[PDB]
């Protein structure tokens, strides 16, 4: 098969991948802490056919050589870590983050993931969990009869008991920051796992060593700019139509070749 | 009878043009992509009598150095060059390629890497402290503020070297990176100066300059030319076949 | 490729450029001091093919020769320099211009740019800047602890200090006028640079030698007429469709020609 | 004129705060204070 057909095919696949990215990005409005995802493409190695000659410069001459090239392979889907807006849930166990940082979470298989999501609850045993039962680390266990919970601006979580005029300090909810936040491996369920492209996680108390602060009762919103997505949808649709035209033109030329 | 060859040439070479357009056209929405404009060269066949034939060899005179149009992303370290500007990047083999892709990235260990094979500025590859929080200025200076330090500590950590070169004095090098043409090397030398007049537009990226209008008629004319060549080939072979009856009997 | 195709593609190029001009001119409402752009096109040379014969005047004879001509190259993008409306910003360090004139700004590289924009500030050293830190030449250095800043109608800028009953004159803010305002080469960041089509800059205090006065606390708004842009947009879309019809008609002519 | 321009975009550069004097509202609270003129509480 000739190069034109497959080059236009990879153009069509790239536009399809961009549309997949946009559709996922648009479905995840109203997903707390979600980060918009941007597809980044790249060209492929150019097959040179005839090297250019020398510019003799005696007369103005066209510098004609020949390289054809191919392909628009998707090279990345970056994650734009900009701070999203906050929404008031009035929910005491909810929490949002001020600046860089993630919550460390123990997965059932034993590894530690990380989430920018604050819709916490408590299991039947009192441990902090994340809408899916993932324990938050280090484990924070609430007594049975707490009148109220308070998570301060640096994660010092405390409860009030009937009778004590003092909120016994029950735990610390510390953060974790990464050297390259964008490199995280999003495994779904609003959790990322650290990889070689992100570096080892650096754990610290909120507000110290570059980690953000904590806002109790508020949850972070998805930072998806729907105007960007709509205009990108128009772009993707028209680029798809253009590449479809390219495929059609090449196919018609091949038909004319094979008639004789 | 040899006319068919010339016609074949045209047909074959037209397909090459198609190929170029296709690669030129799939690469819309590729950051900073430079459209590879193409032309057809007449090639006379100087011979011993009656110079009548010419071939149709296909060629790519260069790239279209027309600045593609900008997308505002507000990302702190997405860079857009002014016209005729280039970011210098340490190529795979190791040499200063030139790109218009300002989609800069930082690794965990602080290597500024426009898509990897990192970026070159005022020295080797630019390195920044790991807690970067990079900001890029208008003339190329790069300042870094560690997240947990007072904001009056944004002392500049590097400079992003930029180079002026366009069109006739730049050619693609079998990667997305451009180099000088070796005709612009007994000139402004192997490694260009920083040209401290090329400006940076921060928070803005540049898209490809793939003109859909001229590509669509590129393809229309290509198809029409191809099937004209097929008509010539058909007539030539039918001529030869009906001619072959001379020699018999 | 026959001449009709390339001529119609020049037409499509022209409509695309006109749409780019309209879109830029449109997006820059709510840009201070912005001057609307108008795309001016010009026809390319006409190739006479068959010169007209002799009009014998014995009968009414059609004067038929044949010249085809080509193309619609864009010849200019005129900057319509007019006094835009004023909007109150209530900022003391802000100023608009009554009539012609440009504030001179020292670019980072050393040359001088010129801006019709009063979104001024003060950097850490008291120097006036232009929303991005470019110093306004000649430098005006506001004292450290001024009670209030006043910029008069002729640029005489003074500050009120704690105790003295006198507005000490701290600087002069003089304007620059050109003999051809339209010829300034725009560079972005609301900046124009002088070129051979504008002549040398002529420096002067406001209100003298044709420079316009200064109005403190107000910003000049863009003189973009959005109704004009909408009507131009309708015209551009219709002309684009007509040219596409020209391309399509020529293409189906060519299809039939190459059939046999 | 030796060329024309097309241009693009309207990127935002700054959000400047207006540091003027606000009105005063009486809170009848002994502790609360307000500022005439400029200055900030550390």
From Swiss-Prot, chains A, C:
SUPFAM superfamilies: Flagellar hook protein flgE. The keyword Metal-binding does not apply. It comes from the Bacteria. The keyword Cell membrane does not apply. GO terms for cellular component: bacterial-type flagellum; bacterial-type flagellum basal body, distal rod. The basal body constitutes a major portion of the flagellar organelle and consists of four rings (L,P,S, and M) mounted on a central rod. The rod consists of about 26 subunits of FlgG in the distal portion, and FlgB, FlgC and FlgF are thought to build up the proximal portion of the rod with about 6 subunits each. Belongs to the flagella basal body rod proteins family. PANTHER family: FLAGELLAR BASAL-BODY ROD PROTEIN FLGG, FLAGELLAR PROTEIN. This is Flagellar basal-body rod protein FlgG. It comes from Salmonella typhimurium (strain LT2 / SGSC1412 / ATCC 700720). The lineage of its organism: Bacteria, Pseudomonadati, Pseudomonadota, Gammaproteobacteria, Enterobacterales.
From Swiss-Prot, chain B:
Its main location: other. One of its GO terms (cellular component) is bacterial-type flagellum basal body. PROSITE patterns: FLAGELLA_BB_ROD. Keywords: Bacterial flagellum. Pfam families: Flg_bb_rod (PF00460), Flg_bbr_C (PF06429), LlgE_F_G_D1 (PF22692). It is found in: Bacterial flagellum basal body. One of its GO terms (biological process) is bacterial-type flagellum-dependent swarming motility. InterPro entries: Flag_bb_rod_N, Flagellar_basal_body_rod_CS, Flagellar_FlgE/F/G, Flg_bb/hook_C_dom, FlgE/F/G-like, LlgE_F_G-like_D1. The keyword rRNA-binding does not apply. Belongs to the flagella basal body rod proteins family. The basal body constitutes a major portion of the flagellar organelle and consists of five rings (E,L,P,S, and M) mounted on a central rod. The rod consists of about 26 subunits of FlgG in the distal portion, and FlgB, FlgC and FlgF are thought to build up the proximal portion of the rod with about 6 subunits each. This is Flagellar basal-body rod protein FlgF. It comes from Salmonella typhimurium (strain LT2 / SGSC1412 / ATCC 700720). The gene is flgF.
